[PDB]
Amino acid sequence: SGAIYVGNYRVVNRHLATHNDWANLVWEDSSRDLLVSSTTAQGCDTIARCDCQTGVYYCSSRRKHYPVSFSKPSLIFVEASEYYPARYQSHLMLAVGHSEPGDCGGILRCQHGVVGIVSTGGNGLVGFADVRDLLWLDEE
Ligand SMILES: Cc1ccccc1OCC(=O)N(C)C
Ligand SMILES: [Zn+2]
């Protein structure tokens, strides 16, 4: 689990979005595993606006933050896990690291702020859904 709180926006994994998220929906994209819902309270997080390929991510299944190198956001074949069927995913960044299902939503951060959230695991690569292209998160 985990979310990004920026302005009056809550950014979650689409697959973990609650009924309330869907009932307060701003934007969702199944190809990116992202859903954004509206918030009453303004949020504390800054989104990175950068092309960084190094950062640190939170891995709940280890209660640890790990420094990683990650690929630039792209369209990736996410292999079937114990939990979820195989599917293609856009705006996904990969690193070598550990991931479990409950790790989805863990933040990946660089010097500029939040880069993305853990979205894909179970087969040796940790995938992060990029948010840095979502400039609109920093306005309205
Ligand atoms: C973070 C993780 C670890 C292990 C399995 C699934 C995971 O993430 C969810 C996922 O891959 N999908 C396609 C919804
Ligand atoms: Zn950066």
Curated annotation (Swiss-Prot):
Active site: H15, D33, C104
Catalytic activity reported: Selective cleavage of Tyr-|-Gly bond in the picornavirus polyprotein
Binding site for Zn(2+) 1: C50, C52, C110, H112
Residue ranges of coiled coil: none
The protein's role, per its UniProt record: Cysteine protease that cleaves viral polyprotein and specific host proteins. It is responsible for the autocatalytic cleavage between the P1 and P2 regions, which is the first cleavage occurring in the polyprotein. Also cleaves the host translation initiation factor EIF4G1, in order to shut down the capped cellular mRNA translation. Inhibits the host nucleus-cytoplasm protein and RNA trafficking by cleaving host members of the nuclear pores. Counteracts stress granule formation probably by antagonizing its assembly or promoting its dissassembly.
Subunit description: Homodimer.
Protein name: Protease 2A
Region of the whole protein represented: 869 to 1008 of 2193
